[PDB]
Design a protein around this nucleic acid. Structure first.
Ligand SMILES: OC[C@H]1O[C@@](CO)(O[C@H]2O[C@H](CO)[C@@H](O)[C@H](O)[C@H]2O)[C@@H](O)[C@@H]1O
Ligand code: MG
Length: 581
DNA sequence: TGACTCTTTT
DNA sequence: AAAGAGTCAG
């Protein structure tokens, strides 16, 4: 392939500082926090340019251009560059188009994760995949300057050529505003959150780990006694031999590889031998120790004593965020021993507090809205306990006739409706038969005929159109909706049902984040957004701001969109994330 | 290195 | 429904 033409500049010139350009600020490290920038490419009306970062980032004019909002840039994964630049004390402004976010909105199923993959969607192939240039795994490395510069320039040239086709298709999809007014402003907001980080009380985590280590050694030794020998408890294969061969415990569930030792299998095995509950206890403690004490500690920055997560804004099929290093969206809450981990997440400044606000049943409320189910809407308009009310309806009983087991099962039905699990999935969850599960679902549709109507209609719409959409026009293609394989087709149907629910909830929280950031600034508060956990926002703020935030945050969240039923937000604050409960 | 298995969250 | 730790082939 002949090299694409470009100037390998030694110095920044005026013609590199046009008010419209494709810009590449290359951070090759997967985790971009305080990570090197290996090179820079600019493409504009005047030409193609490669700049060495030590030159560019020391040039007052270039830096000024980077921070000038009126100088428009087109990029791929602008958040990566923005954050890497934040660590160097440089502001990136004026990013008017992000090809990563554009490709993501166009079809999240494509898994677009480099410029090449995005370009391929429009039959543009004059750019290499990053993996071919940098290698992968242990072989991963930055190549020599000629190879590096050409690659960065080809990526920039691709972005420059692809902006128009991508924007055009977004417009046809009615997704132009979704990109420009939602995902892109959110991206700046996430960059600030990641950069700010969350303070961690490492000392408390460490002493927790010490306590766990003691309890782990105790249970582990007890396990060896009950087995009559030592083995690797964390090896499902070895444990399977102890349980199902040495101890002759029944085999209720198997895997592709051998015996299942899932927690739900073990729970059923407990009455047979004393070893089982000890194994369950071991795995609980071991999960906390390895994943949440040791894992968290590994990624706390020693300089700051903070964790700086990375939100992947371009991954999920539903439009949710995910987060990594650490993942702050699965910190334990359910069981008290796990929940205590949240005590280690503290405010980053003295006399500040953690403030958390969460939507109450936002997914079921969205469902009531999109389905226009009279019963479901009435229930939310009365702010009823939705699980108790669902139990009342399914079992045809009065509120005081609802037993705890009845409510538990109604709750599992709702969870099934919300996440679109199979009737086989409901059966598994409630430990009942499919016939019984199917009866539950059938009773539900009798009490909520509008939801049944919605399930039917959306599946048909997915068939006819080839995709489903959310409130704010996020899209998900479902080509498997026509499949002749039952399991493949059924999963697609469930995704047709679930996506406008989970996706629209994602849309709403994302808008609330944008609305909140603007309100905080207007109100001149020092409060800052730290985390989003699917349906909740977590902030830290001076204690003197708590009373104002108690009024402000739920109002912004509740008013983010207007639905046929109210949105409800609960809130708490305290000296640690644990206490904000 | 990657397929597997298991566990945590919403 | 949909990140990461550990094990065990290759
Ligand atoms: O920068 C986040 C952004 O990068 C992508 C690849 O383009 O993911 C990379 O970065 C993530 C966080 O460090 C990694 O988890 C991921 O494995 C890595 O490829 C995008 O998927 C993401 O939106
Ligand atoms: Mg909640």
């Amino acid at each position: 392939t002949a090299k694409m033409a470009f100037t390998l500049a030694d110095r920044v010139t005026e013609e590199m500082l046009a008010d419209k350009a494709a810009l590449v600020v290359e951070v090759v490290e997967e985790n971009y926090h305080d990570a090197p920038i290996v090179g820079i490419a600019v493409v504009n009306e005047h030409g193609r340019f490669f700049l060495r970062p030590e030159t560019a980032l020391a040039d007052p004019q270039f830096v000024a251009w980077l921070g000038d909002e009126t100088k428009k840039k087109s990029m791929f994964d602008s958040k990566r560059a923005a954050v890497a630049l934040k660590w160097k004390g440089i502001e990136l402004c004026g990013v008017s188009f992000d090809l990563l976010l554009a490709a993501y909105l166009l079809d999240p199923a494509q898994g677009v994760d480099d410029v090449a993959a995005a370009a391929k969607m429009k039959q543009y192939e004059a750019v290499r995949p990053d993996e071919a240039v940098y290698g992968k795994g242990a072989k991963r490395a930055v190549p020599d300057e000629p190879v590096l510069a050409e690659h960065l320039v080809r990526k920039a040239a691709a972005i420059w050529a692809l902006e128009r086709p991508f924007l055009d298709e977004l417009r046809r999809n009615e997704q132009d505003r979704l990109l420009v007014e939602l995902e892109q402003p959110l991206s700046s907001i996430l960059a600030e959150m990641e950069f700010a980080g969350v303070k961690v009380d490492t000392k408390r985590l460490e002493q927790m780990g010490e306590e766990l280590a003691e309890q782990l050694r105790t249970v582990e030794q007890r396990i060896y006694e009950l087995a009559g020998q030592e083995f690797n408890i964390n090896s499902p294969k070895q444990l399977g031999v102890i349980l199902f061969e040495k101890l002759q415990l029944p085999v209720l569930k198997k895997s592709k590889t051998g015996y299942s030792t899932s927690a739900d299998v073990l729970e059923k095995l407990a009455p047979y031998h004393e070893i089982v509950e000890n194994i369950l206890h071991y795995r609980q403690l071991g999960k906390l120790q390895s994943t949440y004490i040791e894992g968290l500690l590994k990624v706390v920055r020693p300089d700051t004593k903070k964790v700086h997560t990375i939100f992947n804004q371009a991954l999920t099929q539903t439009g949710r965020l995910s987060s990594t290093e650490p993942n702050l969206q699965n910190i334990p809450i359910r069981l008290e021993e796990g929940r205590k981990i949240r005590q280690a997440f503290v405010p980053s400044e003295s006399d500040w507090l953690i403030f958390a606000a969460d939507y109450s049943q936002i997914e079921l409320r969205v469902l009531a809205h999109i389905a226009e189910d009279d019963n479901l809407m009435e229930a939310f308009r009365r702010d009823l306990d939705i699980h108790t009310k669902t139990a009342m309806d399914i079992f045809q009983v009065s509120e005081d006739e609802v037993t705890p087991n009845m409510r538990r099962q109604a709750k599992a039905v709702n969870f099934g409706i919300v996440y679109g699990i199979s009737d086989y999935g409901l059966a598994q969850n409630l430990n009942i038969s499919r016939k019984e599960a199917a009866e539950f679902i059938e009773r539900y549709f009798e009490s909520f005929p509008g939801v049944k109507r919605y399930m039917e209609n959306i599946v048909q719409e997915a068939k006819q159109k080839g995709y489903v959409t959310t409130l704010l026009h996020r899209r998900r293609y479902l080509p498997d909706i026509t499949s002749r394989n039952f399991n493949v087709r059924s999963f697609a149907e469930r995704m047709a049902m679930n996506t406008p629910i989970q996706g629209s909830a994602a849309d709403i929280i994302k808008k609330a984040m944008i609305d909140l950031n603007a309100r905080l600034k207007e109100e001149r508060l020092q409060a800052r957004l730290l985390l989003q956990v699917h349906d909740e926002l977590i902030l830290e703020a001076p204690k003197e701001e708590m009373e104002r935030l108690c009024r402000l945050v739920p109002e912004v969240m509740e008013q983010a969109v207007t639905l046929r039923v109210p949105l409800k937000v609960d809130y708490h604050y305290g000296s640690t994330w644990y206490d904000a409960k």
